[PDB]
Amino acid sequence: THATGRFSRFWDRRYADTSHITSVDPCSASYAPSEGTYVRKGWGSGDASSDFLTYQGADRDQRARQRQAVAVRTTARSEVEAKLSGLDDASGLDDGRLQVA
Amino acid sequence: MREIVHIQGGQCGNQIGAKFWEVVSDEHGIDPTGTYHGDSDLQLERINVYFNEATGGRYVPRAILMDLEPGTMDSVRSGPYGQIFRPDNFVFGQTGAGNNWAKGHYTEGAELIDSVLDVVRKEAESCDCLQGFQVCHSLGGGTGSGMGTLLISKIREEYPDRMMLTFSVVPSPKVSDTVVEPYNATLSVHQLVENADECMVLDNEALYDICFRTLKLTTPTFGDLNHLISAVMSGITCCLRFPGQLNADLRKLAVNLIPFPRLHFFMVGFTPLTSRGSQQYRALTVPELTQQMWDAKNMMCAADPRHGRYLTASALFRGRMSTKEVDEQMLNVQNKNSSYFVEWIPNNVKSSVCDIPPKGLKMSATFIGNSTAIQEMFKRVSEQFTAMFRRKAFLHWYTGEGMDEMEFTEAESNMNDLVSEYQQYQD
Amino acid sequence: HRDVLKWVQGLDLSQSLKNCRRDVANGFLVAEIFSRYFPADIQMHSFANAASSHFKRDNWTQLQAFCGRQGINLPGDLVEGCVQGVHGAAIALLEHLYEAFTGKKVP
Amino acid sequence: MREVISIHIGQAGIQVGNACWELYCLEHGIQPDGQMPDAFNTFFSETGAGKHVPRCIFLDLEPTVVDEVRTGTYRQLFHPEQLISGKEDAANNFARGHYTIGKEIVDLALDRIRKLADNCTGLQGFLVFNAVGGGTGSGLGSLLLERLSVDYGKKSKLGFTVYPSPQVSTAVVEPYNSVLSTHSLLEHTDVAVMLDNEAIYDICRRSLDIERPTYTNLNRLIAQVISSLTASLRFDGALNVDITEFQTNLVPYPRIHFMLSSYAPIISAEKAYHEQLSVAEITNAAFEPASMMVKCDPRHGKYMACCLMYRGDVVPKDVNASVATIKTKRTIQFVDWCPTGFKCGINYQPPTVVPGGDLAKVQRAVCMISNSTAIGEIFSRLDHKFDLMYAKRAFVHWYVGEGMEEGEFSEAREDLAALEKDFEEVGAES
Amino acid sequence: MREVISIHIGQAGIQVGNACWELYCLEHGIQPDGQMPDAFNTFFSETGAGKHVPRCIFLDLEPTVVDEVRTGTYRQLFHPEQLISGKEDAANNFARGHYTIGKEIVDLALDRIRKLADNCTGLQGFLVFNAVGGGTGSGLGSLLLERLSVDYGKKSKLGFTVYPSPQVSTAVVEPYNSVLSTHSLLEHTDVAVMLDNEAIYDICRRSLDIERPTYTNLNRLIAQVISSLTASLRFDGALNVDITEFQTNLVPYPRIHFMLSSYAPIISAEKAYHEQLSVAEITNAAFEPASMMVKCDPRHGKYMACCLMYRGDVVPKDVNASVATIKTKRTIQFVDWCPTGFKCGINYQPPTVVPGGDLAKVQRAVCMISNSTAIGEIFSRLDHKFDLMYAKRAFVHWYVGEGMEEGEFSEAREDLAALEKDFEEVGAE
Numbered sequence A: 001t002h003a004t005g006r007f008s009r010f011w012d013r014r015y016a017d018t019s020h021i022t023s024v025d026p027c028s029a030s031y032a033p034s035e036g037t038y039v040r041k042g043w044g045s046g047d048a049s050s051d052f053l054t055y056q057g058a059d060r061d062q063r064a065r066q067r068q069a070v071a072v073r074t075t076a077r078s079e080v081e082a083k084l085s086g087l088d089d090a091s092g093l094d095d096g097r098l099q100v101a
Numbered sequence B: 001m002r003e004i005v006h007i008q009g010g011q012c013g014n015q016i017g018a019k020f021w022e023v024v025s026d027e028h029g030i031d032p033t034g035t036y037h038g039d040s041d042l043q044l045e046r047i048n049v050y051f052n053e054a055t056g057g058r059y060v061p062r063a064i065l066m067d068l069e070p071g072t073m074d075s076v077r078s079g080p081y082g083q084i085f086r087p088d089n090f091v092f093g094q095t096g097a098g099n100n101w102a103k104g105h106y107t108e109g110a111e112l113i114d115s116v117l118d119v120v121r122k123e124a125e126s127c128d129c130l131q132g133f134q135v136c137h138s139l140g141g142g143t144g145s146g147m148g149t150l151l152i153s154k155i156r157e158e159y160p161d162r163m164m165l166t167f168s169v170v171p172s173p174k175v176s177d178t179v180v181e182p183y184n185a186t187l188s189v190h191q192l193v194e195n196a197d198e199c200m201v202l203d204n205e206a207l208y209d210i211c212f213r214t215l216k217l218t219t220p221t222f223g224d225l226n227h228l229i230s231a232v233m234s235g236i237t238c239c240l241r242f243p244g245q246l247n248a249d250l251r252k253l254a255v256n257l258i259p260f261p262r263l264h265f266f267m268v269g270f271t272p273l274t275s276r277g278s279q280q281y282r283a284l285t286v287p288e289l290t291q292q293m294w295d296a297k298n299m300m301c302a303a304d305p306r307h308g309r310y311l312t313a314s315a316l317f318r319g320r321m322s323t324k325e326v327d328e329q330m331l332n333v334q335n336k337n338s339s340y341f342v343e344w345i346p347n348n349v350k351s352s353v354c355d356i357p358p359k360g361l362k363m364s365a366t367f368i369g370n371s372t373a374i375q376e377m378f379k380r381v382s383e384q385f386t387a388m389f390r391r392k393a394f395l396h397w398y399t400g401e402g403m404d405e406m407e408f409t410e411a412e413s414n415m416n417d418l419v420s421e422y423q424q425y426q427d
Numbered sequence C: 001h002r003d004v005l006k007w008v009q010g011l012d013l014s015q016s017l018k019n020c021r022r023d024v025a026n027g028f029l030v031a032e033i034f035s036r037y038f039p040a041d042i043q044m045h046s047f048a049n050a051a052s053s054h055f056k057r058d059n060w061t062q063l064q065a066f067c068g069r070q071g072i073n074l075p076g077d078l079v080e081g082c083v084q085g086v087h088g089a090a091i092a093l094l095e096h097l098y099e100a101f102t103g104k105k106v107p
Numbered sequence D: 001m002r003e004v005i006s007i008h009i010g011q012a013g014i015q016v017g018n019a020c021w022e023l024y025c026l027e028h029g030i031q032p033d034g035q036m037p038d039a040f041n042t043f044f045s046e047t048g049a050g051k052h053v054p055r056c057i058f059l060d061l062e063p064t065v066v067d068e069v070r071t072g073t074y075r076q077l078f079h080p081e082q083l084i085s086g087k088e089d090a091a092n093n094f095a096r097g098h099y100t101i102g103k104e105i106v107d108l109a110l111d112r113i114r115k116l117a118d119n120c121t122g123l124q125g126f127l128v129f130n131a132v133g134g135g136t137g138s139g140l141g142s143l144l145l146e147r148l149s150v151d152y153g154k155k156s157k158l159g160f161t162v163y164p165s166p167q168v169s170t171a172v173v174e175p176y177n178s179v180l181s182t183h184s185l186l187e188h189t190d191v192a193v194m195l196d197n198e199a200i201y202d203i204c205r206r207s208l209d210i211e212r213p214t215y216t217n218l219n220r221l222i223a224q225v226i227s228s229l230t231a232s233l234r235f236d237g238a239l240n241v242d243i244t245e246f247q248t249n250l251v252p253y254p255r256i257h258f259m260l261s262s263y264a265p266i267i268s269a270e271k272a273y274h275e276q277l278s279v280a281e282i283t284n285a286a287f288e289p290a291s292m293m294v295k296c297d298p299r300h301g302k303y304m305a306c307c308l309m310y311r312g313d314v315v316p317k318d319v320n321a322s323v324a325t326i327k328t329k330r331t332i333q334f335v336d337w338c339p340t341g342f343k344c345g346i347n348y349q350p351p352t353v354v355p356g357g358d359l360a361k362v363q364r365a366v367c368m369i370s371n372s373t374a375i376g377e378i379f380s381r382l383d384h385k386f387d388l389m390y391a392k393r394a395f396v397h398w399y400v401g402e403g404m405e406e407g408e409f410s411e412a413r414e415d416l417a418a419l420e421k422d423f424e425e426v427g428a429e430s
Numbered sequence E: 001m002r003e004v005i006s007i008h009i010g011q012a013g014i015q016v017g018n019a020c021w022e023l024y025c026l027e028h029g030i031q032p033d034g035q036m037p038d039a040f041n042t043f044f045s046e047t048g049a050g051k052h053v054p055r056c057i058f059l060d061l062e063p064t065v066v067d068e069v070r071t072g073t074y075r076q077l078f079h080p081e082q083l084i085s086g087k088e089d090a091a092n093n094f095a096r097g098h099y100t101i102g103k104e105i106v107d108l109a110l111d112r113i114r115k116l117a118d119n120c121t122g123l124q125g126f127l128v129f130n131a132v133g134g135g136t137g138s139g140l141g142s143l144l145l146e147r148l149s150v151d152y153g154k155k156s157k158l159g160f161t162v163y164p165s166p167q168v169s170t171a172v173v174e175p176y177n178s179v180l181s182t183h184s185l186l187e188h189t190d191v192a193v194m195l196d197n198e199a200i201y202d203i204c205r206r207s208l209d210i211e212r213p214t215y216t217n218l219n220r221l222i223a224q225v226i227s228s229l230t231a232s233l234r235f236d237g238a239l240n241v242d243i244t245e246f247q248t249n250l251v252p253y254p255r256i257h258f259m260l261s262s263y264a265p266i267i268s269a270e271k272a273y274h275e276q277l278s279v280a281e282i283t284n285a286a287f288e289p290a291s292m293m294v295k296c297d298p299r300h301g302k303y304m305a306c307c308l309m310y311r312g313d314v315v316p317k318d319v320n321a322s323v324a325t326i327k328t329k330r331t332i333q334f335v336d337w338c339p340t341g342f343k344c345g346i347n348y349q350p351p352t353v354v355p356g357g358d359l360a361k362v363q364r365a366v367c368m369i370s371n372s373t374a375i376g377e378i379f380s381r382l383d384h385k386f387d388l389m390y391a392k393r394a395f396v397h398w399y400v401g402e403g404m405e406e407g408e409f410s411e412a413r414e415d416l417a418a419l420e421k422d423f424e425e426v427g428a429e
């Protein structure tokens, strides 16, 4: 209702919504959900300090996850390795041949 | 508590700044009614840099809307975020400049200069400490070019200590809305060198180029350029409005950029510009911002920075960023291509960081660059001016309003003077 | 040649020549030579014997700074060739220092 | 008693000291509100009943860094008018910080120093925290140190000045400001402890295994240097050292008072289970050139004098065993005229860990503060940097117009040039 | 981190890449929409949260194959800006792909290469895909590899170029383009893995029993060769063979970088049940000339270098039993100055099977890439085609009018003639 008569007839095209050229998709890597934007540098509080330095927590957790996954893969490979290296002359081979003969 | 007074001039100045006040009010949480609805107390810590408190919790901008025709004053008022502005600051004419630099400067604009100098003086005395004055206008018009630059001349005699941010757009060759456009540009730049403390140069042909190859917009409307310029102005004052690990005021960026008083023309590029198709596929990191920021296609001036060496540079970072990762990227871009950086100014780049990013962005940056490559744009204006002036084309509109041809030659004699002092630092 | 081979043996440096192009690459031998001709200005204690590129650049930067201070000249191109290990740069620097320190003639 | 008044100048002074006063409250158990739930007397003043106020001032021309302390967690800790704010920043301008806008705010600065120095019975020293690259740290820090020399004669002052780095710097007019501030801290500062940001970046990269350090990570372990050096005044130990004895043992000549700093155990939480911290282990680690907080290599120069600040479970028996192993090391040498260089101090309290910090629980620590002739090359890095800057007169119109005359640039130049001749002559063999 | 960049040039490059990127997304569990429901870092650069984009560029002057990817089943996987299309194709003309309509698209090609190069921390090499018989693959492939050498020095480039067949070709001016494109890849490519469509036709007829094959069948088992070549970087194994390992063991001279290709177990599920795939049985199939991916006879030449990429349940002992029996067999022949010419690489992951591929589930696989002097017999046939072709000077006005000078046909002729001369004398005893 606060429009001059010459601008009210073409108000739609004139102003519109030009925020999309800098706003991003909410389900994207660039989006911040209005909670981490207004962080304060936390001196006395350790959790506030971690929240302010969350990228250090991020890459520390990335390295921890990578080493945990490598540990899981190497334990599985070691189990398969032990099962495959357990085979020898004392294993259950040639016994059926001996029984048939 | 470092206040900035904003002045908008003409069709280009009002439309740019109306979009500018939409962004900064959204960042500070002011609704179109005028109250406050933000979620954090950080928006009220430095609300006074752009907003004067009023009765009832309303916050009014420190904006002086100024024009020689009343049509564009109603354009800002009728749109959204238009009721925040004080109606007392709406200074307007009745006739219109008519794309005439003399009408803005000498004949018709002089009746409004005493009117607009009163509201400038009223707004400067109201606030405590002036950080500087922000002006946004055009150079190809008649209101923002002619009447705008005499306001720059008048405001510097009254306040010779405070800063001057001129977000003046320069006429382009490829997009040419006006045929006397090189005439008004050369006269305005002559009045801009000797008055303004620092100038940021924008071109519409570069803003079109950004909107086509970066943003991938099929039909870039005329307000999509102004939102790019809105992100420019919101980035310069980010350290004033918000806390930071390393602050940078307008005076701090001025001393770090210009080595000499006349080298005060920069070019700005807002860094995290992504197309909607590519938004999910680009990861924002500190190194990923640096490659887009230094890209030649991202800068909002028509001058290619690869032609001339960067004299100095300025980086304005916003978000949760590591200062080692921030400033080691500045030594990577200084070591990888040292041929584009000048040698007698070692460590050309000034870097500063803020911990409050803009709304909806995890990380953002803004670049201010003083380079000797910016002379290429003044050459094209000087080439067009020298082409028309020797034939005395279109001069009877100019000489009929009291502007003699002597100051037309003086304006060109300052045009190649700025080009020459740019050129001797390219060697 | 034989004159500079006799000359480097008379200095009695700790490092053995063998393949001198690889030996003087780290800068330890030329640093020892400069320390012998100027004991007060340059000592061996300001030099680390290592094959690392950063330590090599540090040692050759020390040598360049102190020889520029003292007036002794060796080519920066020869320094770059020595730190990059190109053939003949070490030999050419050896005869250049042989002429520069105490004046004799090259055949 | 014994007290220190820690003044923090410039933004870097506030942020370093903001991490410092976090560390001092955890050292003495003081809560952030200031209520304790006798060693606190040096840094904190007992006021009324159950309230401790720090003996510090936070002065900066820019209001936006000083109100962050006002709004933040430590709001109740400080006296509200003890944090001096300014109307506008110096904006990296030495002339603004020294002449134009630094003259108005320094009158209030000396007033609270008089109020703080009257409160303490026996004043021991002044801690000056600033960065000479900025306008406030160099400009206002120059005139404040000058006015402290005339207001308090002979009283000791300690300068922890963050210094511009060779490779990395955050500004362009920094070599102009640092050269001008070099003259100011040459005569006024009694012991100037150099600090460099790239070296402290390098420490956190390898020792604290953080590939993206920030200013918050630097100032936490810069605070560990200040706490360890000043721990002898607070807590009892086998060999206590005061500020007055610290100067006479480390400053051989009145114009050679520049120091290098190193903190030996910089160990993350994961590494600390495997790392061994013997007394000889940390003394070897302290003298490693990679462990320094100044981008400077001691191999180029000679160690003129050294100090070792041992914290935690360190007996006086094995500190001398580590001294003998350092003195017999070939890579580390002393000057010929100083046979006894080490001046060791031992304290009985282990360093504490801040919540959310990166340093681990460590029994014993070493804070090595030593005078060296290798310091002459960091002054020569910006002797050549500023000379080509001044060669054809850039950024001088900013400094000429704000009160300073042109000739004061020359006066700060042979001050640095005659400083360079002094280190090479003193470290020369005799 | 071990991390590679793949470049696909031309119609053959895009369609091979479609089958290749189908297999890498299946190996790491990457769904086509881009979400995993740690080894992917060599091929997929993770972007923030829940998205993995390929480190590839699909550049072609032909627009119809680029937007087929944009509208296919993999629209959500690839970055839209990395997908580079042009207005008009080079149209079988080496002059057009190099000089006239190659310059205006190579500047955008390097710009996307710059953004991919500085994003990846440790770049291992470029896996370039092109076809020397076409206009874009030969022409733009020449111009791109000119710029990659100048911009990125001493950095490895692996080339899988589809080379024309003596019997069959889908074009007439292929002898012109392939001769001109060989000089470009001779001085600039570090690894050249030849591929011939007729040989992969003959592989499909007898191995998979698919006697009417298409290009989709060809690109799927080409993709098994490329994936097993780079499978050492991705997954852990007994013998890791990095990208830089391949050059130092397979090229003995800088101008000799042409290698045959073979993939030994290529069977269907109706064939896999009866066949007992042993390591010795598989390795004998790799050295068979029937399984070679270039229409060539290895018996005419001599094996100068070799490389074996073992995948799956391969004990490191039985590979040496296969190497020993191969060296004793006299139908192969190694050159007298290379007594140890084998490079064995063992990976602990069985190869994935694409839903719908002709290949079946195999517990073991071998990717064979061996340098031989028989490649001199490959270029000799196409040299005879071009010598007959150029003698009466036909199909030349197309090349002359589009920028190229007449003497560049002549200069590219002794380049292949010198390549013939070198391959004869190096293998000579």
Ligand SMILES: Nc1nc2c(ncn2[C@@H]2O[C@H](COP(=O)(O)OP(=O)(O)OP(=O)(O)O)[C@@H](O)[C@H]2O)c(=O)[nH]1
Binding pocket: B245, B246, B252, D009, D010, D011, D012, D013, D015, D016, D061, D062, D089, D090, D091, D092, D093, D130, D131, D132, D133, D134, D135, D136, D137, D162, D163, D164, D169, D170, D171, D197, D215, D216, D218, D219
């Ligand atoms: N160690 C450390 N150094 C800092 C920090 N913040 C800034 N610095 C240093 O300060 C320099 C920037 O100039 P400053 O001294 O901060 O300038 P200022 O204190 O803001 O004073 P003004 O010039 O008035 O703005 C940089 O070179 C940094 O090395 C910090 O948080 N920690």
Ligand SMILES: Nc1nc2c(ncn2[C@@H]2O[C@H](COP(=O)(O)OP(=O)(O)OP(=O)(O)O)[C@@H](O)[C@H]2O)c(=O)[nH]1
Binding pocket: E009, E010, E011, E012, E013, E015, E016, E060, E061, E062, E089, E090, E091, E092, E093, E131, E133, E134, E135, E136, E137, E138, E162, E169, E170, E171, E197, E215, E216, E218, E219
């Ligand atoms: N293996 C394989 N080869 C192909 C495929 N498509 C085309 N080719 C080969 O490519 C050669 C012709 O060049 P193309 O790649 O089709 O076309 P181009 O190189 O892009 O040249 P222009 O079409 O003019 O742009 C033919 O001889 C085919 O052998 C394919 O899908 N798979």
Ligand SMILES: Nc1nc2c(ncn2[C@@H]2O[C@H](COP(=O)(O)OP(=O)(O)O)[C@@H](O)[C@H]2O)c(=O)[nH]1
Binding pocket: B009, B010, B011, B012, B013, B015, B016, B097, B099, B138, B140, B141, B142, B143, B144, B145, B169, B175, B176, B177, B178, B204, B207, B222, B223, B225, B226
């Ligand atoms: N980027 C941008 N440019 C504008 C806008 N409005 C006008 N211009 C430019 O300004 C020039 C003409 O300005 P003009 O209307 O004569 O300004 P006035 O005389 O002060 O009213 C044209 O070349 C336009 O490109 C705007 O909203 N955004």
Ligand SMILES: [Mg+2]
Binding pocket: D010, D011, D060, D061, D062, D089, D090, D091, D134, D136
């Ligand atoms: Mg400041």
Ligand SMILES: [Mg+2]
Binding pocket: E010, E011, E012, E060, E062, E089, E134, E136
């Ligand atoms: Mg094609």
